[PDB]
Amino acid sequence: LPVSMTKTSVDCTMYICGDSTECSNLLLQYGSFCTQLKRALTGIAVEQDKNTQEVFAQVKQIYKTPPIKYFGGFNFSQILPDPSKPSKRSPIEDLLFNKVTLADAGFIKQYGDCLGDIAARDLICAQKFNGLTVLPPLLTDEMIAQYTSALLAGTITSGWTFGAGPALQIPFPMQMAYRFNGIGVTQNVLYENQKLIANQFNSAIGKIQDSLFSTPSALGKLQDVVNHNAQALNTLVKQLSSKFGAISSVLNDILSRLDPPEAEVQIDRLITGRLQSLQTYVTQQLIRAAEIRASANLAATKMSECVLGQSKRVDFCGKGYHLMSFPQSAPHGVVFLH
Amino acid sequence: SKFGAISSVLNDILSRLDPPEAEVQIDRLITGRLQSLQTYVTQQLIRAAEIRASANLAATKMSECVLGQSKRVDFCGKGYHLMSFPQSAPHGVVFLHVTYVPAQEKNFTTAPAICHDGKAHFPREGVFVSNGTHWFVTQRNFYEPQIITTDNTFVSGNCDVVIGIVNNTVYDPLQLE
Amino acid sequence: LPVSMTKTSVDCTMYICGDSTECSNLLLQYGSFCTQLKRALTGIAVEQ
Amino acid sequence: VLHLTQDLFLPFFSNVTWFHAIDNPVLPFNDGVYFASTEKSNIIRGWIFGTTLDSKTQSLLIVNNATNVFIKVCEFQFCNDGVYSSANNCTFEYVSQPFLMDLEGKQGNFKNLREFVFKNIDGYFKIYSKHTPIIGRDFPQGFSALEPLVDLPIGINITRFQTLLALNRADYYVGYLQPRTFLLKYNENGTITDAVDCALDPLSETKCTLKSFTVEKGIYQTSNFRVQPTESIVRFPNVTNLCPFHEVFNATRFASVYAWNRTRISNCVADYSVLYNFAPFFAFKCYGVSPTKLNDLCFTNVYADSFVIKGNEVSQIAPGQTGNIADYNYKLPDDFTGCVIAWNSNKLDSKHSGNYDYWYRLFRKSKLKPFERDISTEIYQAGNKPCKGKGPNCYFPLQSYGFRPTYGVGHQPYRVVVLSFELLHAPATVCGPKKSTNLVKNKCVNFNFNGLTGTGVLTKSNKKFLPFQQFGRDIVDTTDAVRDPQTLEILDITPCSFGGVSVITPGTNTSNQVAVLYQGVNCTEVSVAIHADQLTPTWRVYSTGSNVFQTRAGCLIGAEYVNNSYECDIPIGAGICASYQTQSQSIIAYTMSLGAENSVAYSNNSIAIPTNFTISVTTEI
Amino acid sequence: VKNKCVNFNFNGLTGTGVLTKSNKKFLPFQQFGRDIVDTTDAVRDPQT
Ligand SMILES: *[C@@H]1O[C@H](CO)[C@@H](O[C@@H]2O[C@H](CO)[C@@H](O)[C@H](O)[C@@H]2O)[C@H](O)[C@H]1NC(C)=O
Ligand SMILES: *[C@@H]1O[C@H](CO)[C@@H](O[C@@H]2O[C@H](CO)[C@@H](O)[C@H](O)[C@@H]2O)[C@H](O)[C@H]1NC(C)=O
Ligand SMILES: *[C@@H]1O[C@H](CO)[C@@H](O[C@@H]2O[C@H](CO)[C@@H](O)[C@H](O)[C@@H]2O)[C@H](O)[C@H]1NC(C)=O
Ligand SMILES: *[C@@H]1O[C@H](CO)[C@@H](O[C@@H]2O[C@H](CO)[C@@H](O)[C@H](O)[C@@H]2O)[C@H](O)[C@H]1NC(C)=O
Ligand SMILES: *[C@@H]1O[C@H](CO)[C@@H](O[C@@H]2O[C@H](CO)[C@@H](O)[C@H](O)[C@@H]2O)[C@H](O)[C@H]1NC(C)=O
Ligand SMILES: *[C@@H]1O[C@H](CO)[C@@H](O[C@@H]2O[C@H](CO)[C@@H](O)[C@H](O)[C@@H]2O)[C@H](O)[C@H]1NC(C)=O
Ligand SMILES: *[C@@H]1O[C@H](CO)[C@@H](O)[C@H](O)[C@H]1NC(C)=O
Ligand SMILES: *[C@@H]1O[C@H](CO)[C@@H](O)[C@H](O)[C@H]1NC(C)=O
Ligand SMILES: *[C@@H]1O[C@H](CO)[C@@H](O)[C@H](O)[C@H]1NC(C)=O
Ligand SMILES: *[C@@H]1O[C@H](CO)[C@@H](O)[C@H](O)[C@H]1NC(C)=O
Ligand SMILES: *[C@@H]1O[C@H](CO)[C@@H](O)[C@H](O)[C@H]1NC(C)=O
Ligand SMILES: *[C@@H]1O[C@H](CO)[C@@H](O)[C@H](O)[C@H]1NC(C)=O
Ligand SMILES: *[C@@H]1O[C@H](CO)[C@@H](O)[C@H](O)[C@H]1NC(C)=O
Ligand SMILES: *[C@@H]1O[C@H](CO)[C@@H](O)[C@H](O)[C@H]1NC(C)=O
Ligand SMILES: *[C@@H]1O[C@H](CO)[C@@H](O)[C@H](O)[C@H]1NC(C)=O
Ligand SMILES: *[C@@H]1O[C@H](CO)[C@@H](O)[C@H](O)[C@H]1NC(C)=O
Ligand SMILES: *[C@@H]1O[C@H](CO)[C@@H](O)[C@H](O)[C@H]1NC(C)=O
Numbered sequence A: 001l002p003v004s005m006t007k008t009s010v011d012c013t014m015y016i017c018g019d020s021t022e023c024s025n026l027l028l029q030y031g032s033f034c035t036q037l038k039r040a041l042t043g044i045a046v047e048q049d050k051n052t053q054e055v056f057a058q059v060k061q062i063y064k065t066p067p068i069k070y071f072g073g074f075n076f077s078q079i080l081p082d083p084s085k086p087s088k089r090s091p092i093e094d095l096l097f098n099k100v101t102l103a104d105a106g107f108i109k110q111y112g113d114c115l116g117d118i119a120a121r122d123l124i125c126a127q128k129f130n131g132l133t134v135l136p137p138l139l140t141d142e143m144i145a146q147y148t149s150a151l152l153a154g155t156i157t158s159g160w161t162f163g164a165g166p167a168l169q170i171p172f173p174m175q176m177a178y179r180f181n182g183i184g185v186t187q188n189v190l191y192e193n194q195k196l197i198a199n200q201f202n203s204a205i206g207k208i209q210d211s212l213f214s215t216p217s218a219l220g221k222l223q224d225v226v227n228h229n230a231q232a233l234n235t236l237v238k239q240l241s242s243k244f245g246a247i248s249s250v251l252n253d254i255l256s257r258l259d260p261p262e263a264e265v266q267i268d269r270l271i272t273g274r275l276q277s278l279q280t281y282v283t284q285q286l287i288r289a290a291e292i293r294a295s296a297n298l299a300a301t302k303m304s305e306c307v308l309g310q311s312k313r314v315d316f317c318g319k320g321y322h323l324m325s326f327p328q329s330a331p332h333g334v335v336f337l338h
Numbered sequence B: 001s002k003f004g005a006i007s008s009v010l011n012d013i014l015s016r017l018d019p020p021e022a023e024v025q026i027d028r029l030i031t032g033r034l035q036s037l038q039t040y041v042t043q044q045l046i047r048a049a050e051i052r053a054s055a056n057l058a059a060t061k062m063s064e065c066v067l068g069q070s071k072r073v074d075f076c077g078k079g080y081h082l083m084s085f086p087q088s089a090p091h092g093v094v095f096l097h098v099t100y101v102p103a104q105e106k107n108f109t110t111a112p113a114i115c116h117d118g119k120a121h122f123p124r125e126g127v128f129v130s131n132g133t134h135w136f137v138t139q140r141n142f143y144e145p146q147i148i149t150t151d152n153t154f155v156s157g158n159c160d161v162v163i164g165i166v167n168n169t170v171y172d173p174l175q176l177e
Numbered sequence C: 001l002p003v004s005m006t007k008t009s010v011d012c013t014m015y016i017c018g019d020s021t022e023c024s025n026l027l028l029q030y031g032s033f034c035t036q037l038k039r040a041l042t043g044i045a046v047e048q
Numbered sequence D: 001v002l003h004l005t006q007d008l009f010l011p012f013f014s015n016v017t018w019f020h021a022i023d024n025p026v027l028p029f030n031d032g033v034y035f036a037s038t039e040k041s042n043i044i045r046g047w048i049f050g051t052t053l054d055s056k057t058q059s060l061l062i063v064n065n066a067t068n069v070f071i072k073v074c075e076f077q078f079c080n081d082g083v084y085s086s087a088n089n090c091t092f093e094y095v096s097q098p099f100l101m102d103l104e105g106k107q108g109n110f111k112n113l114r115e116f117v118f119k120n121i122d123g124y125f126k127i128y129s130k131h132t133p134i135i136g137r138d139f140p141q142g143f144s145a146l147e148p149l150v151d152l153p154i155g156i157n158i159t160r161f162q163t164l165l166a167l168n169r170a171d172y173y174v175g176y177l178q179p180r181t182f183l184l185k186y187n188e189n190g191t192i193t194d195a196v197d198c199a200l201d202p203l204s205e206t207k208c209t210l211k212s213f214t215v216e217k218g219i220y221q222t223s224n225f226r227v228q229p230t231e232s233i234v235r236f237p238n239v240t241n242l243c244p245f246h247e248v249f250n251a252t253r254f255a256s257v258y259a260w261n262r263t264r265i266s267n268c269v270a271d272y273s274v275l276y277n278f279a280p281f282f283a284f285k286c287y288g289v290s291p292t293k294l295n296d297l298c299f300t301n302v303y304a305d306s307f308v309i310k311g312n313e314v315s316q317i318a319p320g321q322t323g324n325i326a327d328y329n330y331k332l333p334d335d336f337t338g339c340v341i342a343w344n345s346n347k348l349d350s351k352h353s354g355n356y357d358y359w360y361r362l363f364r365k366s367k368l369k370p371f372e373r374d375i376s377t378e379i380y381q382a383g384n385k386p387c388k389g390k391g392p393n394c395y396f397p398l399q400s401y402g403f404r405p406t407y408g409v410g411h412q413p414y415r416v417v418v419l420s421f422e423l424l425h426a427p428a429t430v431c432g433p434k435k436s437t438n439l440v441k442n443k444c445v446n447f448n449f450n451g452l453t454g455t456g457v458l459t460k461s462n463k464k465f466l467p468f469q470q471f472g473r474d475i476v477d478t479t480d481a482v483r484d485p486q487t488l489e490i491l492d493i494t495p496c497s498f499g500g501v502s503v504i505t506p507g508t509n510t511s512n513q514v515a516v517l518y519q520g521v522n523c524t525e526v527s528v529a530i531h532a533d534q535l536t537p538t539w540r541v542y543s544t545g546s547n548v549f550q551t552r553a554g555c556l557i558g559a560e561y562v563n564n565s566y567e568c569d570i571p572i573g574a575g576i577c578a579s580y581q582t583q584s585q586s587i588i589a590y591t592m593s594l595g596a597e598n599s600v601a602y603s604n605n606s607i608a609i610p611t612n613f614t615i616s617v618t619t620e621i
Numbered sequence E: 001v002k003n004k005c006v007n008f009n010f011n012g013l014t015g016t017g018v019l020t021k022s023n024k025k026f027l028p029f030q031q032f033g034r035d036i037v038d039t040t041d042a043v044r045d046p047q048t
Helices: A012-016 A021-030 A033-056 A091-098 A123-129 A144-157 A172-181 A187-192 A194-213 A220-241 A251-256 A260-307 B010-016 B019-066 C012-016 C021-030 C033-047 D202-207 D311-316 D324-328 D523-531
Strands: A326-330 A333-337 B080-089 B092-102 B105-107 B120-123 B127-130 B135-138 B153-155 D004-009 D016-019 D033-038 D047-050 D059-061 D072-074 D113-119 D125-132 D147-152 D160-163 D171-176 D178-186 D192-197 D218-223 D231-233 D261-265 D302-309 D338-341 D359-361 D398-400 D414-421 D445-449 D452-456 D481-483 D490-492 D501-505 D515-519 D549-551 D554-557 D570-573 D576-582 D585-591 D608-610 D613-620 E006-010 E013-017
Touching (some): A012 A021, A012 A033, A012 A260, A021 A033, A021 A251, A033 A144, A033 A260, A033 B019, A091 A194, A091 A326, A144 A260, A144 A326, A172 A187, A220 C033, A251 A260, A260 A326, A260 A333, A260 C033, B010 B019, B010 E013, C012 C033, D192 D202, D202 D501, D218 D570, D311 D414, D324 D359
Antiparallel strands (some): A326 A333, B127 B135, D004 D178, D016 D171, D033 D113, D125 D147, D218 D501, D261 D302, D302 D414, D481 D490, D515 D554, D549 D554, D570 D576
């Protein structure tokens, strides 16, 4: 489930009129058309941060797994954080990060190597040339992993009690017995085939890692979100090389190639093109942000129900009689293991 | 806003320019105000969709939290939901979720089952818990120890497959009478 | 409960410039304004 | 109301020069002057304006006296002490009520402070004033508005400024205005209670984007920061051969319009000052370019079409026109980018007994396509006769432009020469006389590489330009690399520094301190730009060494990094939050604590069961 | 005429609406009126 999108903070002044005073004066004649755009994108960014907060920040106390790890037979090393890794992330959580490629990290401070780009500069340098920047998320993808680790260590050491109040420790065999009792099967079944069910759980966990290793793309939803964002940004940059029926598409060209009395006609055309192009980007970003907010509210509800307890609604927390759920952090989203 | 016109007042550019030429400026004002009223309408549509999502959420929250008890965790407030009371607020609704939250707990002990005579005994509804020397059955969300009887537990097993099974004596109200 | 809407694939080229070469030439000066529209409508159809 | 204005205002906490008296320096005047004085009764009468203050340019004079004012515009000669000795060509006399008001409460301690503001926008001399009975002793800061007195259109040139004195048997407060954006707080009764600048302090720039005099706790995005370039490099090609415009303006037989001679001007330096000396022009109508802005452009090729035509036909030649010449003789294309030149020559296309050397075409089978010659002598058909001869219904196509020294101007030989440019993306073979300055790399500079104007940073590259390659670009078609015309080397181009400034402030009712966040830019770059004073931000927030913090979201100036962990208060970005905390108070940035560090006591057989309960009532809106 | 919908041409300021007495505190140099969204509000009577 996608949880957030790329946070953009476009500037009308530089995007429409790159370092130009005459064009800025002409744009001032359109009223507060671009204060609206800046406000809308600021609201979108704040809403994405709130979406991440809703989805992951569900536990106040950050829990930790016990120093030893023997949960009655259930093998959780595949989703618990790995101390050896510097990033402290799960093995299944690394594949999601290695299978999604972000065009712009945002937290790069890339300025200083557009000169050092040597070859033809890329999308990011090209966007920076026309005032088109991307903000970084408030929550790093290193403490989102900490939120996920706390959530997963609270559901395997305390059951669902940590989702209501104080985290009450409960052995994992008895937690499984309770989850079984919650779907209409008596507890004795689990205690009579605990070894078999532990083997089944371990096999199921083991065969979900290869299913993401070898598949072309199962994260195609998150990659679709990222591609839509980068492609909207690209189709918004590419509108700055369009004449819009003007003499030339370069402000620094038509400014030095015409006197101010006549250059106003062409600058007006370029402004009325770039404003209508930046109002398409803002509108599609608002619509996509509403869609992403719906998906993130769905993800937050799914976390609060599937993860912090047992859900009696059929086909909500996976197919079958739901028992438990594990969250995993993915680029701009979350992954549930039902 | 002039929108690149002579003046931003229609009653001014109409009384200052003849109809053949004032059309050029009035067209500019129209194409500015129409694009300004199509931004307002579009953003109002988006905000109305968002408000509809929030209001559908509120209606579902009312129908579940208010008109019943919700087994969904963290939907009707934090904790085990008990009730919810609605209150009307300007352009919205306010919910007063009454929830049951546990309190002071103690380490006791637990076993998956109790093996009295070759047979594993499991709690009908609750946890096998131990003060430390005397095994007790109790609920899950509240401590209420009870003597382990054949009514509290149901029996099925052979006392060789349950891992963590403890040795204790269950009671029957039948042999005495 | 509504489940889907009508799937449309409106084409800018013929809608805006019916079988016209000069009009298409002028429309090419607006950049990728209509590739966006076709993509949005295709996304809507796939989403339905 | 919280109305926001952009006009000439005296900057807040600016420099005002305080004088004394006991000779009378002539202060410069520009963008207006703010004047203030604190006096007992009267020692300052008025002011003098104008340029060079002599009997060669006009000047102003605004001396007050006991009853009236004496405003005028004139060309006074001098006084060197009756304040003038000349009123020769002098009009615009004006008289009204006096500017000076003085009142005393039976005592001289009421030293009223008189404040004045003058400016000369589009003439229309504006004067503002306000007499505050203060306590002018120390020029207080208590806000004080200014009411206009008179607005009179002198419409002259003012650069210098002076003042007059009085007699007898600590004043002169002068400040200079600047174009600034102000946010003014209006009282209910219509006065102005408070005003805040919008280019002074980070808090001020925020208080004037939230158009409010109170900024609630949080982080607010105000503007962006750019590094204005230090130097301007213009790198034109390695050619010094002056163009043959001489030999296109020094010719003797500019051909007739039916055969428009077309020369080609390439591989040359085009200084159009030689175009401006061989011809006392009558029509320099340029269409694609401004004639003033012609020495700073580079053209791939230049065509000089030369032909002598009659007077009305000069007005004829233009993009999209009509007539016997514009249709059958010479048709300038509609999207023309160039200039037309027409000057009078009845000395070379004239003689006694007359001349008829020139020619033109009134008879063509169709219109002439743009830039097409049609030299041919075919008799125009009439009726249906294939006739080959002259006479009725049988007409020769081209008739004469017989030129003589005596007709009206509407019928005289103007030697029209039109210049056609190709101002597109291609190697430039013709450039203006602009000199080729040096090259500086690794520094924000405005570049004019072969007519490609822009801004950015340049450096060495390892690109593999093919020998024919000249420009560079990227996947979104933005110019990336330019081959140096005089070094044949490859230089990449960077944005200036473009980023975004966000101001992190607590509530204004708590503190006036702020933190500044420059988005996604290394803080060494913003530090060197600040020390070079080349940053667009004119609000310079302090940098004490403990207020710099390279965040993954940019760098933070004005907040110190604490190594503790607290709940997030103001979200900055990338796991860093800022808050107002005691030391005795300052703004600190920290890494957000996700919650209490808790460890569960999971075991094989240990269980925690609640022995009690609580009932909590939460709220949802 | 006050308290009646009338077309006014106050000193070249054309418009339509209803006029009446005020208790505004126009400074002597003040001539026009407006509000927070820049719409002409009160006009000082040129002959009263
Ligand atoms: C839990 O599951 C782990 C799977 O990651 C097991 O780790 C394995 O370790 C062996 C080497 O001993 C590797 O060859 C193998 O690829 C895997 O990494 C781990 O042993 C297992 N532990 C228990 C108690 O079941
Ligand atoms: C086990 O639970 C018992 C509750 O029945 C506690 O035993 C009590 O002991 C007193 C005497 O000390 C008896 O009089 C009483 O009837 C009861 O049996 C006992 O405290 C508890 N064990 C621990 C370790 O808490
Ligand atoms: C619970 O009680 C059983 C009998 O009441 C025990 O079974 C015994 O097991 C021992 C070996 O451990 C045998 O030697 C003996 O004959 C009898 O079968 C059982 O072990 C005991 N379990 C625990 C955990 O105490
Ligand atoms: C706006 O102007 C009003 C008219 O003068 C002021 O009301 C007056 O207030 C004084 C006291 O200051 C009274 O004595 C007088 O009768 C009248 O009510 C009003 O205060 C003023 N508002 C301001 C200055 O904010
Ligand atoms: C247009 O007229 C120009 C000036 O007479 C010609 O330029 C010169 O022509 C002479 C020959 O008359 C050359 O010797 C000299 O090098 C220079 O080119 C130009 O040729 C002429 N063009 C046409 C198309 O007639
Ligand atoms: C469960 O928790 C209750 C409050 O959360 C306890 O009630 C308290 O009782 C004391 C008096 O003993 C009051 O002073 C206090 O205000 C509160 O009402 C209750 O005793 C407690 N029960 C157990 C068994 O711990
Ligand atoms: C149970 O005992 C462990 C061991 O010290 C302790 O850490 C934990 O807090 C205890 N839990 C209780 C008393 O609820
Ligand atoms: C005003 O001038 C003084 C004297 O040079 C200087 O110290 C002060 O910094 C100036 N004011 C400002 C705001 O720079
Ligand atoms: C002051 O100036 C006015 C200007 O007309 C003049 O009439 C008057 O005589 C002067 N002197 C005094 C004392 O008013
Ligand atoms: C006024 O200006 C004219 C301009 O030609 C000049 O001839 C004349 O001498 C001037 N009058 C003076 C200086 O009194
Ligand atoms: C005004 O005077 C200044 C200073 O001599 C000069 O540079 C400027 O060109 C003048 N402008 C006009 C319009 O006279
Ligand atoms: C033509 O050339 C001669 C060369 O001596 C020069 O004197 C004359 O001024 C030139 N005239 C024009 C119109 O270029
Ligand atoms: C530029 O011209 C100078 C002078 O002839 C020459 O020394 C230099 O090599 C030239 N450089 C290039 C790149 O043409
Ligand atoms: C940005 O970070 C630091 C601080 O300036 C320095 O290493 C260099 O300027 C940049 N480094 C990289 C890897 O971009
Ligand atoms: C305290 O902060 C400094 C930097 O300000 C950091 O190097 C150090 O590791 C911190 N100490 C602790 C215990 O966090
Ligand atoms: C739980 O049991 C396993 C296997 O019997 C053992 O390795 C582990 O140490 C035990 N842990 C506790 C807390 O009793
Ligand atoms: C308007 O003019 C008349 C005629 O002089 C006069 O009686 C009246 O007082 C004037 N009113 C104003 C407001 O000037």
